[PDB]
Amino acid sequence: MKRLETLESILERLRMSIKKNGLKNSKQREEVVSVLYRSGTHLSPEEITHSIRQKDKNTSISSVYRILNFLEKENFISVLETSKSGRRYEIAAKEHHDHIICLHCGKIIEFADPEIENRQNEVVKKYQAKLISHDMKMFVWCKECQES
Amino acid sequence: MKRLETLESILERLRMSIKKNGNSKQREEVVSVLYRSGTHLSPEEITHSIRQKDKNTSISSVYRILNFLEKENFISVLETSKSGRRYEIAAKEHHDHIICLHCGKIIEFADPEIENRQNEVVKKYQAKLISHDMKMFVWCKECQES
Amino acid sequence: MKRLETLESILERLRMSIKKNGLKNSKQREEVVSVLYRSGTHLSPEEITHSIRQKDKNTSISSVYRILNFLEKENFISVLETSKSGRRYEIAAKEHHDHIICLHCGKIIEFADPEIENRQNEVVKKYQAKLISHDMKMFVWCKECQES
Amino acid sequence: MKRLETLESILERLRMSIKKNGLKNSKQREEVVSVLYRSGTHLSPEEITHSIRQKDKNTSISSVYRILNFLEKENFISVLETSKSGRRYEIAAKEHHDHIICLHCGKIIEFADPEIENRQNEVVKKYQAKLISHDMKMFVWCKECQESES
């Protein structure tokens, strides 16, 4: 895996933010962040709650949302909207990429296409604008869901 | 002021839907407001327009309408942190959006080469492209000028 | 009072956001927004909680923290750091102002001095930078804590 | 690199503060101070760790945070916090200044404007209050980020 920051560094920043805000449940906040860091992959709140529940039965999805919102707000993690509410999360410390999203099964495929990246800048420059960031997702039926 | 469809045709279809699903007038007015508009409108502005003819209309009733219309594909939503939620008539040719991070200005575009390349890219995964959503966030020409 | 947005509009946006975040449907959460909106001061969570407990006597200050943290992330309210630990909150839909904060009593005085606002721009111009926003706090001993 | 005090003087005050607090001298803690003293910018804990690891590779960032927390609470260093730049640190032995921060590239520009400083005094005088301290940050698009690439 390629990450833009170390987990240790992320944890120290998290711990500082936690102390700063006087937040409780340091243990689970750290767990959620570590699960995403190690996965690289895009997980649903349900899959995250499932993941950390294995260690502590006290875990509720409501608590996880408070965690994911905290983590999202502090830019520790990134959120992907897959539906009207369907959402998935990944560690924020990854190289830029866009998303192919299978409507059927939910599979996420990362991509970064040089031609699209370049053309986007070209379009914007036609307006003498400066490209800061972009949000681009393609919704598909994946090859496996088509064979199904 | 182009559309893929006349307002009357859209309203025909609308009057169909409000029966299949179970204030047909106010729905039609909201659609009409958006159809006549050349911009993407917030719930607040839509409400304001409606209030001109129907004073004391609550924004909450407009939201309920917008949610139904969006659900049934009569209108589409553009949502960013900077600009909030804005709506437009669905009966327009496909386009994507540029949004200024500073002033919130929205610029519409549709680049044949980008659309083509998106199709080439998905073929690499032997997936079938159903739809996409593309937003570019920028500093616009006017915001950059001293 | 002067508000840049109606309470009903804010509440509709909140409800939209509740759904999108896939969160609970909360009266107390709308209650907190309402208290801050209607108030002409900057409130502590203790003050907000005292307001909330008029109806729900069992209300914990922890539930209030949880609400505040969500509203601030969604930009419905603004947080002012009065101390390393001290937090105060206000509705986001108010015209720009900066803060005078008494170190001894905690009194908050809003101000917007046209000269200060202009000088800030003049300063950034010296560096050929464009001013986007600013955060200015002045900590003082108010006239009443002085005389007393 | 205008400093209010020699590095050596600061490190001796540090030694005295360490003994007073019942702590143990460490070269690493002195190295954090020295890195910051030597720096012409504002450094993140990560960057400080990078520098320290040039001499001791197996240094942990948790140890640097602990050091930073002590140094800052005892006023050997100052911290600047923004969402955009996160927490960044500098040696405390510098003339008073406020901060400009670029929202795009995170660059920090220091400034000290006598007229602004005087105007703040005038303003609090309007309320018959006594100014004690202030925190002033301006967020900008800096000159370099505004440059067109076309």
Ligand SMILES: [Zn+2]
């Ligand atoms: Zn991209």
Ligand SMILES: [Zn+2]
């Ligand atoms: Zn699939």
Ligand SMILES: [Zn+2]
């Ligand atoms: Zn991703």
Ligand SMILES: [Zn+2]
């Ligand atoms: Zn497109």
Ligand SMILES: [Zn+2]
């Ligand atoms: Zn603009």
Ligand SMILES: [Zn+2]
């Ligand atoms: Zn549009």
Ligand SMILES: [Zn+2]
């Ligand atoms: Zn101001």
Ligand SMILES: [Zn+2]
């Ligand atoms: Zn006072």
Ligand SMILES: [Zn+2]
């Ligand atoms: Zn205020």
Ligand SMILES: [Zn+2]
């Ligand atoms: Zn100053």
Ligand SMILES: [Zn+2]
């Ligand atoms: Zn910059």
Ligand SMILES: [Zn+2]
């Ligand atoms: Zn500084």
